[PDB]
Design a protein around this ligand. Structure first.
Ligand SMILES: *[C@@H]1O[C@H](CO)[C@@H](O[C@@H]2O[C@H](CO)[C@@H](O)[C@H](O)[C@H]2NC(C)=O)[C@H](O)[C@H]1NC(C)=O
Ligand SMILES: *[C@@H]1O[C@H](CO)[C@@H](O[C@@H]2O[C@H](CO)[C@@H](O)[C@H](O)[C@H]2NC(C)=O)[C@H](O)[C@H]1NC(C)=O
Ligand SMILES: *[C@@H]1O[C@H](CO)[C@@H](O[C@@H]2O[C@H](CO)[C@@H](O)[C@H](O)[C@H]2NC(C)=O)[C@H](O)[C@H]1NC(C)=O
Ligand SMILES: *[C@@H]1O[C@H](CO)[C@@H](O[C@@H]2O[C@H](CO)[C@@H](O)[C@H](O)[C@H]2NC(C)=O)[C@H](O)[C@H]1NC(C)=O
Ligand SMILES: *[C@@H]1O[C@H](CO)[C@@H](O[C@@H]2O[C@H](CO)[C@@H](O)[C@H](O)[C@H]2NC(C)=O)[C@H](O)[C@H]1NC(C)=O
Ligand SMILES: *[C@@H]1O[C@H](CO)[C@@H](O[C@@H]2O[C@H](CO)[C@@H](O)[C@H](O)[C@H]2NC(C)=O)[C@H](O)[C@H]1NC(C)=O
Ligand SMILES: *[C@@H]1O[C@H](CO)[C@@H](O)[C@H](O)[C@H]1NC(C)=O
Ligand SMILES: *[C@@H]1O[C@H](CO)[C@@H](O)[C@H](O)[C@H]1NC(C)=O
Ligand SMILES: *[C@@H]1O[C@H](CO)[C@@H](O)[C@H](O)[C@H]1NC(C)=O
Ligand SMILES: *[C@@H]1O[C@H](CO)[C@@H](O)[C@H](O)[C@H]1NC(C)=O
Ligand SMILES: *[C@@H]1O[C@H](CO)[C@@H](O)[C@H](O)[C@H]1NC(C)=O
Ligand SMILES: *[C@@H]1O[C@H](CO)[C@@H](O)[C@H](O)[C@H]1NC(C)=O
Lengths: 90, 162, 98, 152, 147
């Protein structure tokens, strides 16, 4: 170790469990409310409607999301698997 | 001198570590391996409830192992640990704070990251607001401080030419 | 990079007909280990004579201790403005049909 | 001699730690701004929350740091089309409201800019402003006028 | 010896002042950016000019610093509703143009994102796109066609 010569290390104020809890709470807020919880009280919203709102934000009509919703969901799942697999491979 | 679990050569009779410190030595009285660990040391810390609130204080140790509660950030004395959790105001470290709460005495507890509330999620349910409140948020941002000039000739030297 | 030429005309346009969802990874550190170093244990050992010459450098020792304490307080505060954006925790719903 | 030597090393270590702490503060401020914008909503800043049109991001806990799993919107397949800025019908100039005029070989349609979806040019998706002579690259066409079959 | 000691004392103060000046410069850059965005216009950056939907900020003079009196827009009271992403009328799917389909139990309306104001679904606030055999979730209704 590096503590035998008087170089004591301060433990962090926030333990890793509490950081994980904060990240999980933020993830739940961003999948169940979108941006309403980040600018006030949390407002419930379905995830496809949040995706359609983001599609309208980037300049695309919302009907193209519902026309191929299964394709977009499969692409998102494949992307999640891809980032997990590439992360597992520093 | 703790009892070690690692054996050595038959002639060396000493030890070292990665930081290049002699932390092991055989005892040639009976060829017994013994570790060397530095003695306990640290600094004391004082938990104060505040001015015009209380008078009693608590004494906190950083990494010294031991009314008296053994925390993960050392040894805490003078504060009674309580299982329930509130929002803390005086940081300590390792996930536990200290506060003055009901007479009334200083207590130590795990912090609460927030109000435990679960939002209702459904595929055909929303929450559209029908009213709003205009709120004002105050933010403080310093842009400068005092400008000072330092000259050696008047500072390091006085009234002597040497 | 790749040497390519894009065709430009005053009456020609290119608009997409398909899209792919991609995930981008960004690594951003916010804090590190906090260490407190004092002159009594590092510079001196167990000798009084070393401390008898340390009263002329107690001022710099105070400056270093204050700088290290400020660094530790700053690092403890740095976690607060990134992860504690909301004061309400949100439990995940038991229904995973998104 | 030993203490005067050790003061310099301690001071150098303190200065290095202070520089590292300043860099850590800058990185933490950048991470906090990213968390406030890309995670806590949708950020309109292009090439700030990843390459492509940003949709959302998923923050995850990291040892002595943070990571962001940004969700972007990048197109894959593109086509070629002949476009016009304005269309002349009856001595009037029609401009697309929320679209762009494109023709494949003989028929002109109005589609959104970020996705291909041909639609028939009517009076609801175009607005009349000016005459035919002002526009340089104007193209003759006919406007459907959906009110005409309905009023009959 | 005195000169060496005083020079050693004089260098650490200079280093600390340089670090503090760098921190002050960074804070001043952040404050100038916040001024130019939130005060000199309206900033679309969420949670940058305060918690909530920023509208304007009023700068005030401070000793060796500056403060901003941001004006934010947060909701107060909300109501739950049953929603549908699309509506089929007769072989045609109606999508809201700048609204959302909300229901109170036996009727349907159209409302905005951050405020509640019900209306009547018609051919002016909705646009047609394809059939209703492609949308996963749809609810039957009718439009007005005011002509
Ligand atoms: C929205 O909230 C405001 C703030 O509470 C409400 O205004 C209050 O209304 C009550 C009753 O109408 C009055 O007694 C208060 O004096 C009002 N306060 C202020 C500051 O004006 C308002 O009524 C709410 N609107 C709705 C539709 O609920
Ligand atoms: C847009 O790109 C996606 C991704 O390649 C296409 O989806 C693929 O479609 C083929 C044939 O339809 C399937 O064999 C693949 O399995 C699909 N991949 C995924 C990930 O779903 C989609 O067809 C493309 N759309 C257009 C109009 O070109
Ligand atoms: C350009 O696009 C239009 C519309 O998609 C095409 O017109 C259709 O062509 C098909 C193919 O024979 C016919 O069955 C339809 O009746 C046509 N529709 C109309 C309204 O006329 C047109 O053929 C395309 N041109 C080219 C060169 O691809
Ligand atoms: C678009 O239409 C206009 C009018 O319908 C055409 O202008 C006519 O051009 C002919 C010969 O080019 C002249 O004899 C007429 O006097 C013009 N009429 C007007 C009102 O200007 C124009 O040529 C057409 N453009 C194309 C490319 O066909
Ligand atoms: C749901 O909304 C509809 C439409 O606003 C309500 O129907 C009207 O209710 C008012 C209130 O008494 C009546 O005066 C109207 O005659 C009703 N119109 C129709 C066409 O029914 C309905 O009452 C609302 N239901 C609930 C539970 O709030
Ligand atoms: C919504 O309307 C559609 C069509 O108007 C309904 O679909 C019909 O359902 C009946 C029996 O449920 C069938 O006999 C018809 O052949 C269907 N027609 C079509 C065009 O699909 C649908 O049932 C309605 N939904 C609800 C909930 O009433
Ligand atoms: C502290 O000391 C006691 C007794 O000496 C011992 O039981 C306890 O395990 C020690 N704590 C740690 C963390 O080792
Ligand atoms: C707090 O409650 C828990 C519940 O099991 C108990 O184990 C613990 O002893 C309590 N703490 C104190 C200080 O009484
Ligand atoms: C098709 O697209 C390519 C893009 O490089 C372009 O060069 C070509 O001219 C287009 N075809 C026609 C007929 O314009
Ligand atoms: C486009 O440019 C070419 C070459 O300068 C020219 O011949 C043609 O008329 C132009 N077309 C338009 C619509 O401006
Ligand atoms: C609306 O109702 C649902 C269940 O019926 C409930 O979970 C939710 O909290 C309600 N919303 C409000 C704002 O009361
Ligand atoms: C919503 O989800 C529930 C649970 O899976 C399901 O029974 C219901 O049909 C869904 N409704 C829609 C409109 O998708």
């Amino acid at each position: 170790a590096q503590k035998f010569n008087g170089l004591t290390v301060l433990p962090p104020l926030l333990t890793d469990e509490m950081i994980a809890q904060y990240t999980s709470a933020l993830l739940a807020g961003t999948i169940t409310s979108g941006w309403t919880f980040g600018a006030g009280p949390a407002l419930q919203i379905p995830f496809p409607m949040q995706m359609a709102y983001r599609f309208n934000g980037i300049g695309v009509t919302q009907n193209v999301l519902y026309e191929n919703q299964k394709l977009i969901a499969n692409q998102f799942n494949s992307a999640i698997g891809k980032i997990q697999d590439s992360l597992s491979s520093a | 001198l703790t009892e070690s679990n690692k054996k050595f050569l038959p002639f060396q009779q000493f030890g070292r570590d990665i930081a290049d410190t002699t932390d092991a030595v055989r005892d040639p009285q009976t060829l017994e391996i013994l570790d060397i660990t530095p003695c306990s040391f640290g600094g004391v810390s004082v938990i104060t409830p505040g001015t015009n609130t209380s008078n009693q204080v608590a004494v906190l140790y950083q990494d010294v192992n031991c009314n008296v509660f053994q925390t993960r950030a050392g040894c805490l004395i003078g504060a009674e640990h309580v299982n329930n959790s509130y929002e803390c105001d005086i940081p300590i470290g390792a996930g536990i704070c200290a506060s003055y709460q009901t007479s009334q005495s200083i207590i130590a507890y795990t912090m609460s990251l927030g109000a435990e509330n679960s939002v209702a999620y459904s595929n055909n349910s929303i929450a559209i607001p029908t009213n709003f409140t205009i709120s004002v948020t105050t933010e403080i941002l310093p842009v400068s401080m005092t400008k000072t000039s330092v000259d050696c000739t008047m500072y390091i030297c006085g009234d002597s030419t040497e | 990079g790749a040497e390519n030429s894009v065709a430009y005309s005053n009456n020609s346009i290119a608009i997409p007909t398909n899209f792919t969802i991609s995930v981008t990874t960004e690594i951003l550190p916010v804090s590190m280990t906090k260490t407190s170093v004092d002159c009594t244990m590092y510079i001196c050992g167990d000798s009084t004579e070393c401390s008898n010459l340390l009263l002329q450098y107690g001022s710099f020792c105070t400056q270093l201790n204050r700088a290290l304490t400020g660094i530790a307080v700053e690092q403890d505060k740095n976690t607060q403005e990134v992860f504690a954006q909301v004061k309400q925790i949100y439990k995940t719903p038991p229904i995973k049909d998104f | 001699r030993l203490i005067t030597g050790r003061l310099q090393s301690l001071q150098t270590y303190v200065t290095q730690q202070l520089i590292r702490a300043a860099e850590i503060r800058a990185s933490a401020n950048l991470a906090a701004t990213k968390m406030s914008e890309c995670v806590l909503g949708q950020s309109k800043r292009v090439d700030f929350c990843g390459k492509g049109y940003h949709l959302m991001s998923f923050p995850q806990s990291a040892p002595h740091g943070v990571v962001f799993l940004h969700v972007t919107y990048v197109p894959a397949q593109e086509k070629n089309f002949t476009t016009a800025p304005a269309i002349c019908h009856d001595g009037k100039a029609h401009f697309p409201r929320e679209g762009v005029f494109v023709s494949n070989g003989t028929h002109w349609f109005v589609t959104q800019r970020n996705f291909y979806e041909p639609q028939i040019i009517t009076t609801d998706n175009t607005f009349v402003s000016g005459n035919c002579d002002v526009v340089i690259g104007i193209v003759n066409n006919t406007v459907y006028d959906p009110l005409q079959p309905e009023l009959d």
